[PDB]
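Blackboard transcription, Thursday session:
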Amino acid sequence: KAFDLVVIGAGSGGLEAGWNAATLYGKRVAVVDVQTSHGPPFYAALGGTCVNVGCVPKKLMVTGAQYMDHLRESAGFGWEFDGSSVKANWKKLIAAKNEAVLDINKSYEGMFNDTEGLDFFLGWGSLESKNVVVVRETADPKSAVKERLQADHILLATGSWPQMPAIPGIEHCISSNEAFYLPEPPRRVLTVGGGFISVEFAGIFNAYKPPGGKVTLCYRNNLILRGFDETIREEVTKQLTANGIEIMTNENPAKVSLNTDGSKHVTFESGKTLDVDVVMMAIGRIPRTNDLQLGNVGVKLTPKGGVQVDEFSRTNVPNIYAIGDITDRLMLTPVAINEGAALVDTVFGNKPRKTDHTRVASAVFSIPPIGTCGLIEEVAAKEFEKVAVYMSSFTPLMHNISGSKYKKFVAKIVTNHSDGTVLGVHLLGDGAPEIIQAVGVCLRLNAKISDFYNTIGVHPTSAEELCSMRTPSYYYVKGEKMEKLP
Amino acid sequence: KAFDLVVIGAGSGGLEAGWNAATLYGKRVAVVDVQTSHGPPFYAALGGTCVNVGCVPKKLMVTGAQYMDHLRESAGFGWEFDGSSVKANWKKLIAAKNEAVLDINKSYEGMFNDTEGLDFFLGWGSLESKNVVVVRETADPKSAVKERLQADHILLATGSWPQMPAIPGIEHCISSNEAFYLPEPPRRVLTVGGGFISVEFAGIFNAYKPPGGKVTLCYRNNLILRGFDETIREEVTKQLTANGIEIMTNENPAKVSLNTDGSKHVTFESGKTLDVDVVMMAIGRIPRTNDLQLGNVGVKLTPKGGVQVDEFSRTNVPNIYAIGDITDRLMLTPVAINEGAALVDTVFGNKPRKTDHTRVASAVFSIPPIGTCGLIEEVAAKEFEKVAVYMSSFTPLMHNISGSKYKKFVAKIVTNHSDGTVLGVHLLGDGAPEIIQAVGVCLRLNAKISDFYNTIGVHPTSAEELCSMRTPSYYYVKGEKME
Ligand SMILES: Cc1cc2nc3c(=O)[nH]c(=O)nc-3n(C[C@H](O)[C@H](O)[C@H](O)COP(=O)(O)OP(=O)(O)OC[C@H]3O[C@@H](n4cnc5c(N)ncnc54)[C@H](O)[C@@H]3O)c2cc1C
Ligand SMILES: Cc1cc2nc3c(=O)[nH]c(=O)nc-3n(C[C@H](O)[C@H](O)[C@H](O)COP(=O)(O)OP(=O)(O)OC[C@H]3O[C@@H](n4cnc5c(N)ncnc54)[C@H](O)[C@@H]3O)c2cc1C
Ligand SMILES: Cc1nn(Cc2c(C)noc2C)c(=O)s1
Ligand SMILES: Cc1nn(Cc2c(C)noc2C)c(=O)s1
Ligand SMILES: Cc1nn(Cc2c(C)noc2C)c(=O)s1
Ligand SMILES: [Br-]
Ligand SMILES: [Mg+2]
Ligand SMILES: [Mg+2]
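(Written on the board underneath:)
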């Protein structure tokens, strides 16, 4: 019942911290989660949000959705078929995804049993005191104590949870959590939000919709994918539109009612209406702090609800740390993992290390996908006197043959024009997520535009475009956009 | 007519050199090629081997061949269709490829029309003297003179040509050149060679073969793709086999005769026999120096037939340079292009530059594909006291669902273990050619394994494997493997 480390949440960050502590420093670790395998009622489970209702299932489902493009595109390369026999069996996709996620759930179970002093506890973690975690049967603080855990160090890794706008008929709407388990693919769906989860799911639904189906994505402002490169935001919008997805910008649901047939009558703030079979809210995720009872030990939260941390993932309470989505910064699995590894190398390995939250490669499995690392030009332009933008945007040849002429590949490099240093790389097109990973290493090594253009291309690839840009397309000078320097 | 530079071969390296000399250095430039557009009789043409009968068309045809796998694999993700109603129309593929190649031919035609001081001449270029290129009607040096071009500077850029073994019945065999123009897809095809062209064409033929067809690849040695990472060589063998390609290793054609029905009767050195519709020789490519009459100026060749060059692409004759495959070093379009730029910068820019032929990212568009940059471990292990190998090999999750459970993604990093410097990165699996490009930039920046494993992964990707390897799988210490 006494542990070097107690971790609340057996997710991306929590398991990395847990496993590393146990196996790298022979430490004694307790990991708490509410559920041992994916799905209702708690959705996240052993493995965390990414494994159960996140990156893993989403990617399998986006891969499934990609086959709609492959069938259509194959014809240009001489593939012949009756397009009339083509059906997208959503139920098969969901059962395959479920089997894949369950096997990972079982993978982690074996990990805990096989591993000395690494123990899993089922139930709800909360803080009783500085050095005691209590595991309860429910999220209610009043429920039975399954366990009392003595902790030299406590790690909070409870991640995040979908925010559902408090509108009349929100109970008719789902989140990404329920999207993973729909028994049937919606004919008509409204994905609410302009971020990666809304965009990815619009893609998935668009491929699996029954005949005369329609995917509508709404976003409360003017242009989806805030924080992404502007060229890419406008291009993804076009390419989603080109593939039959209806993008409603400057629109936001005001309420939902059930029609008598069980469909959803959506009324927008603008007064517009839309009938859909599914309303999926993806307007944001919020740190899961409530249920930990942070009032009991005085862990400080931010003006946004995230556990306040320093560079070393330390709370205001010594021995108590927080990593991943609960910190409400970059909500990415590899960041959570990095923070967990760093924390344990600091606290248990006597090798202090801080996660670098700059120059993080990330992706959107939009169709087609985004791969990005480092600063967008608007952000670079406020920090640096002289910023150069290099841009190549063209439909690759195979997509002239495929018939998908709308699939422009976009490659942008943003530099500090004073020394050539690459500040950001932004890709839109097939392969972008794979291309961008080694770009992350390049940025860690402080690569300049001349390091890219002096490297010999791999031909033929989209990636070689990154090694073919020698001349800026335009600049920002003291924040001002212009074709040419003074 | 008088030119600052005459370029023989309007190819990857020749066009880079010509354009750079004309537009960046304001030189007057002549370029010669034997054909204005792709295909028979001379196959390569304006644009070079890559455009006409290489990288460009082959990548399109592999993309086409990849849909066979997308067809089968879609079913695991719930796609449901009439499997018996699906046909691979090779005629449509070839027509789509031809239009794509012709469009490039035409744009090069336009580039010559619209670029002042860059002139294209049609026919066969050779050296009359050290400042005179003669353009003639045919490869025969007694053929009619079309032009005589006075040249301050001459660039040899004629590329390479398929090697055909002097065996009985060679005339009943084709090379990659003819493979691009087969009117119908062969039911039975033997690809001869373990190199990238044989492997890539085996994948193309395998996808478009008519019902009950069969692709056989034969190679003289024990394991295909010599020069590639050994783990990758064994996996690509297994993955080709799993997709119905017969890999005949330690086998080589002794002779070919025609069966009565016009099919090819192949006799292997081992006595073995195989009847096929097509025999594609992909056993090598040799520099195209015969037709250049280099004996007229005394340009030094190797016994191989390549033009010998210093690191600046200089022949033993001043004002005569060679770049690209004719130099028989690295036969890649981007290397030829790099050599052309470096030469012109050197000669016309007084900006002296040599192409680094080390740490060049390359690909094989096998199914699945390879991406590689830098040294394989066996090579590193001879040149370094301590070599670490970081290896990750696993069927990615999507391929458990797709049913292609044979599709292991291999990621291998080879380091100098004394300081962690990455010497080589070798990838097998979907995306590998796209992943390896920015790896080339890493190796230029002398990336260490710690630069890889301290970089935060993009998830979920195959590429993140490169950033998830903290601990060597095994070592070479003074040439010896130690697990
Ligand atoms: C739809 C979707 C798609 C995504 N796609 C990607 C992607 O492609 N790439 C990417 O990098 N990221 C992606 N993410 C984000 C990624 O899932 C998260 O950043 C990551 O899982 C956060 O890790 P963590 O360690 O913060 O917590 P999580 O992995 O969320 O783990 C939290 C765990 O804590 C448990 N828990 C919560 N409260 C308690 C309690 N009181 N007691 C016990 N256990 C508790 C939960 O059951 C859960 O298992 C996606 C997210 C979603 C929702
Ligand atoms: C099937 C195949 C696939 C390939 N795939 C790839 C790949 O994916 N990626 C890659 O990087 N490389 C690839 N290559 C290699 C690439 O094509 C070559 O390395 C590149 O084209 C060589 O460029 P170059 O300038 O040396 O010559 P080339 O591009 O071959 O140009 C030589 C030109 O000279 C002309 N010529 C020859 N003799 C004469 C003469 N006497 N007078 C006038 N003109 C003449 C020819 O008509 C030709 O246009 C492939 C090669 C082949 C055969
Ligand atoms: C720094 C930057 N971040 N990103 C990607 C991203 C991530 C990760 N989460 O939200 C956005 C937007 C950019 O494109 S600039
Ligand atoms: C017709 C259909 N058959 N397929 C398989 C396929 C083909 C053929 N090319 O790309 C894919 C993917 C479908 O997904 S509908
Ligand atoms: C150095 C290395 N070069 N390569 C790729 C390659 C190329 C290009 N031509 O022959 C080989 C083999 C490796 O795999 S190790
Ligand atoms: Br061998
Ligand atoms: Mg245990
Ligand atoms: Mg001209």
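Lecturer's comment: Residues 90-114 of chain A form the longest helix (25 residues).
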